[PDB]
């Protein structure tokens, strides 16, 4: 058919990106906002985080495909910077644009970049200082990594709970939290909130006065497939070989229910000795009223509807083995939660599996009556969880609020890449994308992304001072004192995911449809 | 029917499709490259330095857009590389030649300038080609690692070549080391999914992924008995046809199991004897092969007799109809290494067959199965230059300085040839020199003054040997710089290049039927 | 489209979406409200006062407002007066940013303005509580708040629905120190007057009362959505007129096919049967023979209301029902609920928590407009029980807050200086709403409500007094909202506003 070539294909590329990018620039720091997102489903989503906006919907361009790619990098590889990663490239693109606006090769200006990124990486090592993984040292990173991602006040209460979650570790040291994430969204009088609740929490537990709400000594038979069949890890018919056989099973189906409670009432006394130790069958389907009562009446807690995750985290948490049957099991495999506690909050029971024998799994209780509030608060958590988890995995920490970038753009002082000056321009180009965080904020916040940053620049050129645009009012300060300190996992990776995709479009002279 | 097609229109569209396909690909060429990014009609973007990958996946058109991929594929299979050259070469010669010469109005003298330019190209190449050691993998390295960096990947320059270096030397033919003709079933590469380059090494021999696929099969038994069919497992696998009933529905299930029950006896007579290896070219059915795996008889299947014959002798064997029937005795082992590596659950049997025609299926690994491929894609071109240094120890230095080395040598023959043919033979000459110019205009500045300095350099300093740097543009020595354009690969791209343009010359006319 | 770009979602959509939802309240809030007819997919005219009632049937495309309708439903369940207020309040709050948008103040900036000020305002709300009152029993005293909360939500009898729902909410309970979701349900019944409405505590089936009367004291039901044509486990009977001889066998069989039913009904036990489905000719005549009460052909309304109040659950089939499927009521009896003779249960401590206010009139919309009221009489009374605090009737507290939050703007200075000034402005559209229903300018209201400059009582409501805008004391008028009402109505209108006020363009493929 047709194609596009020369700078015509290039113009479509570089324009579509920076046409999409500044749309995303509306949000960063706390002075960013929460961008309304409605995908084909019709749900409104408000996110200052990149991955949501990037991976849901896009104004469709050939560039819109690569942007989520390196967006699939930042959140994956780090989780802090998804908001920050986008704003870097087009600021660098408009720079390089100038050089090819002058006219030049996108190839020679390509070679003018990555060294500067490699430089800044060096410079990032240089300017940063390794910092404590201490809880309160994390806070200044925690708020910021959250706050660069999501708005302050949410990030502020998240600063507490996220650190409380990432400090909950057994010293399983990760960039993210897999197990520390157990999210319980609850309809509540609090529309945006997250409650930290330790230990594995079960999707539900069953009510009955004889059924113990408090199990401190738990022998947990994980229970999935219901009372209604004998020794069955899956519910299926023992009958229905003809038309009238349909009636016979349900006539004999109530038998297995009593057979099954018979197993559990004895398996308690088998394993637990007397009934003082609550024998825990968490029945991940509904417990039939008779055995619901008769397990209650025997002291067994028959818990209604845990999760497959609450089955696997149980295998983790309780240090015991799960099962898909209620069958009598050897007392060994039965899980032990140092606390099995059914917790009715609102009308809903959330059964704590606590004293996790592997407390890498904790639980967050999310709050809202309105899902649009309840979704958004859930969203701000986890992108900041792994962000602040990049705080406590990192003994190195990089000070935020433009402290380190003026330590690059100025210390990139040119003719160090003197050869063609294309690097001297490319590093200059790269130097100019560094300050987008000092830019976007003094942009979003008061004064000017420029007239404040000149102080930042100046005040950094002053006394080598760590200095930066406020995340809040957009005025100069000392960013080291403020404590705004970016994850050491962000900075390096934040650079890589930029210049690698910033390299591609330059070498792309061609597009065809 | 009344139809006719006139003159230039096809020729134009030829020249049109000729140069356009050449454009991005020739800018994707060289140490300074570009990228050709397709945008699918569906919205998917496809970015590849190889337009052959781009064009086949996008609209392919009746003009030379049909005739470029054919000669690319013609350039794909033989040596294995030059894939991007022919279309940038054929698009190069046709334009500059035809129009001016069709403005001089003649097809015929244009046709001859090709064969004219063919020999001088052969001449100054074979002259200024530099013989490099066939038995020195280092003297191989600098010439072979040059052809890896050519397209998208310098990653496997060392590694693929290293794995390619000795293997190809350790290959032979039916006509004999490997050398001579192009046979790439002696170049073979089979992937090890996942794995690591450290688990990888040089396998100078062949692997059969299907030799040992299970721990049950013969493993590490180093005097193999490979058996070709004919008695133990006969040519005929057909049904036993016992108690068959056409009037019974149960017999339909019987006849399919009955195929393998006779095959059961086929692999059972393998058990009754146990030649440690069994090969079947029509393949063995599983039910019989389970019994093979009971007897520790490695079951070779879905790899050819010729393949196995080349592998058998090269791993050693005595073939029999059945081990109780000895046709004649052959050597027990032809290989020094019988190795079965397990990555995934799959067992990969690597039998190094040293100085053997074999199949030469060489062990190679990337960090994952995907970059595993770029071992091979480089290995191929590496084994290409491995067989090339064996084929043609003499192979040119150049950054495309060969493309000048011919053109001025053309011109200085053209000046010596005179005639009207001077002009085509020169109009063919100046074509060649845009290819390296695009490499060194990607570098920058005045690439003409470079070509000035080049054609200054040409008779002054050297032509192709003392060359132009594809990453720089200055006059250098590509041998000293370690960059090498393989003689065969050079000439071969041109043999393929000259013809398609002659076809496009021949065609002013097509039909719809 | 629900997908948008071009800053509409920021500087346009919200202020458009709000007054759409709102400006019912502006004529629907205050000492009365002016009903607004709604038609549904079913064609009929539904007059509306409560904000969440007109918006419930209003189906919005607005990505903006879908946040706020919930807040009204939140506000509704909470208190029930002020849901109107919530829409018109946020009507003032958001639009003032347009100026600060023209003035150039950023998004979070002025939002922090209303926020710290609605934090500042929520701080003052307990201070601006003006007296208090309650009785866990008394109709009249409690009626006045339940009167004045439904004032906005009712143009109709203020005192009469005051006294009923006060009775209802109270006298369904042994305490009414506890108050719950359904403590009152309604049998909407026409005839006589709309002020003939009566509070009868129990489950009314306005449906037929059939079967021979067997029990009065025993109201225990085995509740069934199962029709009785003979529907029972072994043979599920229906009424089939297909042939005459098969009908002859039905009457024979049904007497027995109905036998094992009302048996199994009274086996598991009851003398009163709730049949959510049909009961056949010989099926009912056997209930006449069996001596059980079949309350037949009920609605899903009369089915669920019982299933809600007695905790039991209808059976679509007939299996012996459990006690989970069988509720008990104080007494089953035939009495007129607002002069309507059917089966009306009694509910206090057996299962309970249903008063029946019979909603009345000459049409259903009159029963829907008194539905508007007592729903808040339900809601506000819970607040009243939760807090007996009384706070100046809507708009009389505003003039207080505006003065306070005004100079609070000059305690602010910095871009929230004006946004708090604007938040001091965010209060005052409420009496404007009141005066705009009255049609008069609040500009006269404002100055007079500022005349004395305290604002503890003075307001201009919905009157013929307001016809020339005239300060009245909603405090003294008996118009006193509840603190939580005054707290909730500010909170979510500020909450749902700030979250929809940071929205950006919709991204869509």
């Amino acid at each position: 058919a047709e194609v596009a070539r020369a700078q015509a294909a290039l113009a479509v590329n570089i324009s579509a990106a920076r046409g999409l990018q500044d749309v995303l620039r509306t949000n960063l720091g706390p002075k960013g906002t929460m961008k309304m997102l409605v995908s084909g489903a019709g749900d409104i989503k408000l996110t200052k985080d990149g991955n949501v906006l990037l991976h849901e919907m896009q104004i469709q361009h050939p560039t819109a495909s690569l942007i989520a790619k390196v967006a699939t990098a930042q959140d994956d590889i780090t989780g802090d910077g998804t908001t920050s990663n986008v704003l870097i490239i087009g600021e660098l693109l408009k720079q390089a644009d100038l050089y090819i606006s002058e006219g030049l090769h996108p190839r020679i200006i390509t070679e003018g970049f990555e060294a500067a990124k490699e430089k800044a990486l060096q410079f990032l090592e240089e300017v940063k200082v390794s910092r404590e993984m201490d809880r309160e040292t994390l806070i200044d990173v925690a708020r910021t990594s959250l706050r660069t991602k999501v708005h302050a006040e949410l990030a502020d209460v998240l600063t507490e709970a996220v650190v409380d979650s990432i400090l909950a570790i057994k010293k399983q040291d990760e960039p993210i939290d897999l197990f520390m994430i157990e999210i319980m969204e609850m309809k509540h009088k609090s529309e945006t909130d997250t409650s930290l609740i330790r230990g594995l929490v079960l999707d539900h537990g069953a009510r009955h006065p004889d059924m113990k709400k408090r199990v401190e000594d738990a022998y947990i038979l994980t229970c999935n497939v219901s009372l209604e069949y004998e020794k069955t890890e899956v519910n299926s018919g023992f009958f229905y070989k003809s038309a009238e056989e349909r009636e016979k099973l349900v006539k004999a189906e109530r038998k297995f229910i009593e057979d099954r409670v018979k197993k559990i009432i004895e398996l308690k006394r088998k394993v637990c000795g007397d009934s003082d130790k609550g024998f825990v069958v968490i029945n991940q389907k509904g417990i039939d009223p008779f055995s619901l009562d008769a397990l209650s009446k025997e002291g067994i807690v028959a818990l209604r509807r845990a999760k497959r995750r609450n089955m696997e985290r149980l295998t983790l948490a309780c240090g015991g083995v799960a099962l898909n049957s209620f069958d009598d099991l050897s007392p060994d495999c039965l899980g032990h939660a140092g606390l099995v506690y059914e917790y009715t909050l609102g009308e809903e029971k959330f059964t704590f599996i606590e004293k996790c024998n592997n407390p890498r799994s904790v639980t967050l209780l999310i709050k809202g009556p309105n899902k649009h509030t309840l979704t958004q608060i859930k969203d701000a958590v986890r992108d900041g969880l792994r962000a602040v988890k990049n705080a406590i995995d990192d003994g190195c920490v990089v000070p935020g609020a433009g402290a380190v970038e003026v330590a690059m753009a100025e210390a990139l002082i040119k003719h160090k890449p003197s050869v063609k000056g294309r690097a001297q321009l490319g590093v200059q180009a790269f130097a100019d994308a560094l300050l987008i965080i000092p830019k976007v904020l003094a942009q979003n916040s008061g004064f000017d992304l420029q007239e404040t940053l000149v102080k930042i620049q100046a005040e950094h050129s002053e006394s080598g001072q760590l200095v930066g645009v406020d995340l809040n009012t957009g005025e100069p300060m000392v960013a080291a004192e403020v404590g705004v300190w970016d994850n050491y996992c962000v900075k390096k990776q934040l650079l890589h995911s930029c210049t690698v995709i910033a390299t591609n479009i330059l070498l792309v002279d061609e597009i065809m449809r | 029917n009344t139809k006719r097609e006139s003159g230039r229109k096809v020729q134009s569209g030829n020249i049109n499709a000729a140069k356009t396909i050449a454009d991005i690909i020739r800018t994707c060429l060289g140490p300074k490259s570009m990228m050709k990014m397709l945008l699918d009609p569906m919205g998917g973007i496809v970015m590849t330095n190889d337009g052959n990958a781009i064009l086949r996946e996008i609209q392919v058109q009746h003009p030379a857009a049909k005739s470029m991929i054919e000669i690319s594929r013609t350039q794909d299979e033989e040596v294995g590389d030059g894939t991007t050259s022919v279309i940038i070469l054929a698009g190069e010669m046709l334009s500059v030649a035809e129009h001016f010469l069709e403005q001089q109005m003649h097809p015929t003298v244009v046709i001859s300038a090709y064969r004219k330019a063919l020999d001088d190209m052969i001449s100054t190449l074979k002259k200024i080609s530099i013989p490099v050691d066939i038995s020195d993998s280092d003297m191989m390295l600098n010439i072979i690692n040059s052809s890896i960096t050519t397209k998208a990947i310098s990653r496997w320059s060392s590694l693929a070549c290293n794995i390619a270096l000795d293997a190809v030397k350790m290959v032979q033919f039916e006509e004999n080391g490997r050398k001579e003709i192009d046979i790439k079933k002696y170049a073979r590469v089979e992937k090890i999914p996942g794995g690591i380059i450290e688990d990888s090494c040089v396998l100078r021999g062949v692997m059969i992924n299907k030799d040992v696929t299970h721990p049950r099969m013969r493993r590490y038994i180093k005097n193999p008995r490979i058996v070709l069919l004919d008695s133990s497992l006969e040519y005929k696998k057909g049904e036993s046809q016992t108690d068959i009933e056409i009037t019974r529905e149960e017999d339909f299930t019987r006849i399919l199991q009955m195929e393998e029950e006779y095959i059961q006896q086929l692999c059972e007579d393998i058990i009754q004897l146990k030649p440690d290896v069994v090969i079947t070219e029509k393949g063995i059915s599983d039910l019989a092969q389970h019994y093979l795996m009971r007897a520790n008889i490695t079951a070779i299947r879905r790899v050819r007799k010729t393949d196995n014959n080349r592998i058998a002798r090269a791993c050693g064997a005595r073939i029999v109809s059945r081990p109780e029937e000895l046709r004649e005795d052959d050597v027990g082992t032809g290989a020094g290494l019988l190795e079965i590596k397990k990555i995934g659950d799959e067992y990969f049997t690597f039998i190094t067959d040293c100085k053997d025609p074999k199949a030469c299926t060489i062990l190679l690994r990337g960090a994952s199965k995907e970059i595993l491929s770029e071992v091979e894609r480089n290995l191929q071109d590496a084994m290409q230059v491995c067989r090339n240094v064996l084929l043609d120890p003499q192979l040119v230095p150049g950054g495309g300085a060969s493309e000048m080395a011919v053109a001025h040598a053309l011109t200085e023959k053209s000046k010596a040839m005179t005639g009207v043919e001077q002009w085509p033979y020169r109009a063919v000459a100046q074509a060649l020199e845009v290819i390296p110019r695009t490499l060194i205009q990607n570098c920058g500045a005045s690439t003409i003054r470079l070509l000035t300095s080049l054609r200054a350099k040409h008779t002054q300093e050297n032509c192709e040997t003392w060359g132009v740097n594809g990453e720089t543009g200055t006059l250098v020595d590509m041998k000293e710089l370690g960059i090498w354009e393989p003689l065969a690969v050079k000439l071969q791209t041109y043999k393929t290049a000259v013809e398609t343009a002659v076809l496009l010359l021949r065609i002013d006319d097509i039909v719809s039927g | 489209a629900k997908h948008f770009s071009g800053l509409e979602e920021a500087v346009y959509r919200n202020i458009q979406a709000c007054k759409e939802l709102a400006q019912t309240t502006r004529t629907a809030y205050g000492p009365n409200g002016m009903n607004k007819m709604v038609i549904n997919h079913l064609e009929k005219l539904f007059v509306t006062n409560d904000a969440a009632t007109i918006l419930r049937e209003l189906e919005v495309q607005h990505p903006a407002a879908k946040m706020i309708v919930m807040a009204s439903h939140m506000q509704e369940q909470e208190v029930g007066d002020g849901t109107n207020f919530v829409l018109v309040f946020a009507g003032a709050l958001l639009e003032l940013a347009e100026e600060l948008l023209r003035i150039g103040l950023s998004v979070s900036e002025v939002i922090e303005g209303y926020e710290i000020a609605c934090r500042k305002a929520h701080e003052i709300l307990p201070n601006l509580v003006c007296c208090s009152a309650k009785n866990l029993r008394d109709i009249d005293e409690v009626s006045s708040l339940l009167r004045t909360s439904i004032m906005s939500k009712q143009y109709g009898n203020e005192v009469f629905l005051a006294k009923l729902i006060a009775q209802a909410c109270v006298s369904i309970f042994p305490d009414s120190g506890h108050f719950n979701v359904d403590n009152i349900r309604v049998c909407k019944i026409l005839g006589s007057g709309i002020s003939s409405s009566s509070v009868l505590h129990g489950m009314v089936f306005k449906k037929e009362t059939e079967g021979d009367v067997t029990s009065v004291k025993d109201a225990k039901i085995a509740v069934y959505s199962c029709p009785f044509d003979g529907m029972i486990t072994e043979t599920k009977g229906t009424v089939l007129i297909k042939t005459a001889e098969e009908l002859m066998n039905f009457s024979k069989g049904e007497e027995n096919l109905m036998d094992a039913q009302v048996k199994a009904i009274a086996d598991t036990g009851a003398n009163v049967v709730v049949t959510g489905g049909k009961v056949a000719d010989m099926a009912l005549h056997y209930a006449n023979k069996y001596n059980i009460m079949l309350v037949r052909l009920n609605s899903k309304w009369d089915l669920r209301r019982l299933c809600k109040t007695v905790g039991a659950t209808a059976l679509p089939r007939l299996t012996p029902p459990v006690l989970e499927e069988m509720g008990h009521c104080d007494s089953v009896y035939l009495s007129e609920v607002g002069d309507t003779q059917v089966v009306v249960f009694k509910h206090e401590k057996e299962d309970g928590a249903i008063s029946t206010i019979v909603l009345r009139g000459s049409t259903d919309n009159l029963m829907d407009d008194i539905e508007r009221a007592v729903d808040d009489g339900v809601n506000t009374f819970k607040v009243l029980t939760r807090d007996k605090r009384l706070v100046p009737g809507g708009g009389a507290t505003e003039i207080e807050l505006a003065k306070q939050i005004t100079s609070y703007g000059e305690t602010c200075p910095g871009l929230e200086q004006y946004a708090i000034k604007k938040f001091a402005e965010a209060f005052e559209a409420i009496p404007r709403a009141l005066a705009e229903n009255s049609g008069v300018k609040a500009n006269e209201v404002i100055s007079k409500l500022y005349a004395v400059h305290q604002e503890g009582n003075k307001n201009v409501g919905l009157d013929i007094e307001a016809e020339v805008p005239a300060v009245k004391d909603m405090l003294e008028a008996g118009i006193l909202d509840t603190y939580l009402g005054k707290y909730w109505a500010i909170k979510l209108a500020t909450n749902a506003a700030v979250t929809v006020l940071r929205v950006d363009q919709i991204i869509m493929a």
Side-chain angles (χ1 to χ4, degrees), chain C residues 445-502:
Chain C
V445 174
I446 289 158
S447 64
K448 296 191 306 296
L449 271 58
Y450 298 161
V452 64
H453 292 87
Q454 178 60 57
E455 309 170 350
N457 41 28
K458 276 79 179 183
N459 188 346
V460 179
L462 275 62
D463 286 337
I464 64 111
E465 294 178 351
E467 183 177 2
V468 174
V471 290
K472 67 178 180 180
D473 292 342
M474 298 177 83
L475 170 61
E476 299 176 352
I479 299 181
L480 285 167
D481 294 347
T482 179
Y483 164 78
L484 298 179
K486 303 295 284 188
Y487 174 78
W488 296 113
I490 294 192
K491 186 174 180 290
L492 297 180
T494 55
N495 291 341
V498 297
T499 186
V500 72
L501 183 57
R502 293 189 181 180

Side-chain angles (χ1 to χ4, degrees), chain A residues 23 26-27 31 33-40 42 44 46 53 57-58 151 191 369-370 372 376 444, chain C residues 2-3 9 63-64 66-67 70 74 106-109 112 492 495 499 502-509:
Chain A
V23 175
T26 62
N27 298 338
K31 296 304 288 185
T33 60
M34 296 294 179
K35 188 179 298 297
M36 176 177 279
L37 198 163
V38 176
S39 293
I44 300 99
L46 297 175
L53 298 169
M57 291 297 179
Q58 62 186 21
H151 189 64
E191 292 180 347
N370 298 337
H372 58 78
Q376 184 171 354
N444 296 135
Chain C
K2 188 171 179 289
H3 301 288
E9 291 299 321
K66 293 179 184 299
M67 298 175 184
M70 296 175 182
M74 294 299 295
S106 295
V107 177
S108 178
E109 294 174 350
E112 294 170 351
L492 297 180
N495 291 341
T499 186
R502 293 189 181 180
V503 302
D504 295 343
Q505 72 176 23
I506 290 113
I507 57 179
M508 179 64 181

Side-chain angles (χ1 to χ4, degrees), chain A residues 376-450:
Chain A
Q376 184 171 354
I377 184 55
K378 173 184 63 63
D379 297 345
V381 176
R382 292 171 295 180
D383 285 343
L385 287 174
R386 62 183 68 91
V388 181
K389 184 59 174 170
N390 291 130
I392 193 173
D393 64 8
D394 285 345
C396 295
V397 177
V398 179
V404 299
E405 300 309 323
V406 289
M408 172 61 180
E410 292 181 348
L412 181 58
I413 184 63
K414 275 66 180 178
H415 290 288
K416 55 184 292 180
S418 63
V419 53
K420 294 184 172 75
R422 57 175 179 183
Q424 178 169 353
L425 294 177
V427 306
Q428 182 176 355
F430 175 80
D432 297 346
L434 301 174
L435 300 172
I436 197 88
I437 292 190
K439 287 188 289 290
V440 68
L441 291 172
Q443 182 180 356
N444 296 135
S445 60
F447 304 102
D448 289 343
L449 63 83
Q450 42 186 9

Side-chain angles (χ1 to χ4, degrees), chain B residues 54-66:
Chain B
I54 303 294
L55 292 175
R56 287 189 292 271
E57 295 302 322
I58 198 52
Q59 181 63 58
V60 177
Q61 293 178 334
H62 59 286
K66 186 187 293 178

Side-chain angles (χ1 to χ4, degrees), chain A residues 1-3 5 13 60-63 65-66 105-108 111 420 422 504-513, chain B residues 23-24 27 31-41 43 45 47 55 58-59 61 441-445 471-472:
Chain A
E2 294 178 351
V3 295
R5 176 58 176 162
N13 297 134
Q60 187 60 57
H61 292 84
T63 60
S65 295
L66 295 178
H105 301 292
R107 173 62 186 86
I108 68 180
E111 186 176 1
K420 294 184 172 75
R422 57 175 179 183
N504 301 133
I505 301 305
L506 296 176
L507 298 182
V508 172
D509 298 345
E510 177 68 15
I511 193 96
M512 179 169 177
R513 62 183 63 85
Chain B
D23 291 341
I24 180 59
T27 60
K32 288 191 172 76
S33 64
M34 293 293 181
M35 295 295 179
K36 186 181 178 63
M37 179 177 282
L38 172 62
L39 174 62
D40 292 345
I45 61 175
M47 177 181 71
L55 292 175
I58 198 52
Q59 181 63 58
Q61 293 178 334
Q441 73 180 21
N442 289 337
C443 296
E471 69 189 345
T472 301

